[PDB]
């Protein structure tokens, strides 16, 4: 099931997933793809997936197949990195000493 028909739409085999690695190497971070359970109807099953960079938890994503899922999850991740705008987790309280 492999053809060479590409024009308006691009069906690259894991486009985003490729952008991640290219970043994990340059920067030097650790990217991990956690395989989440399946969610959806009995007829149509959607496999969820998520990526983890620098011990960070990214917003998983749904996808027809493991691939479609992984690629999607990466979309949200790569979209963030480009901005690298992370939100502070631990709020420095009155702790002064």
From Swiss-Prot:
There is a cross-link at residue 75 (Glycyl lysine isopeptide (Lys-Gly) (interchain with G-Cter in ISG15)). Residues 15-83 form the DRBM domain. Induction: By type I interferons. It is found in: Cytoplasm; Nucleus; Cytoplasm, Perinuclear region. Transmembrane segments: none annotated. Disruption phenotype: Mice have significantly elevated numbers of bone marrow derived hematopoietic stem/progenitor cells (HSPCs) and which are more actively proliferating and resistant to stress. This is Interferon-induced, double-stranded RNA-activated protein kinase. It comes from Mus musculus. The gene is Eif2ak2.
């Amino acid at each position: 099931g492999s053809s060479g028909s590409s024009g308006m739409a691009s069906d690259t085999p894991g486009f985003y997933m490729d952008k991640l690695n290219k970043y994990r190497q340059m920067h030097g971070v650790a990217i991990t793809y956690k395989e989440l359970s399946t969610s959806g109807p009995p007829h149509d099953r959607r496999f969820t997936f998520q990526v983890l960079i620098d011990e960070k938890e990214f917003p998983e994503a749904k996808g027809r197949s493991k691939q479609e899922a992984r690629n999607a999850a990466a979309k949200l991740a790569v979209d963030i990195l480009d901005n690298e705008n992370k939100v502070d987790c631990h709020t420095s309280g009155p702790s002064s000493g």
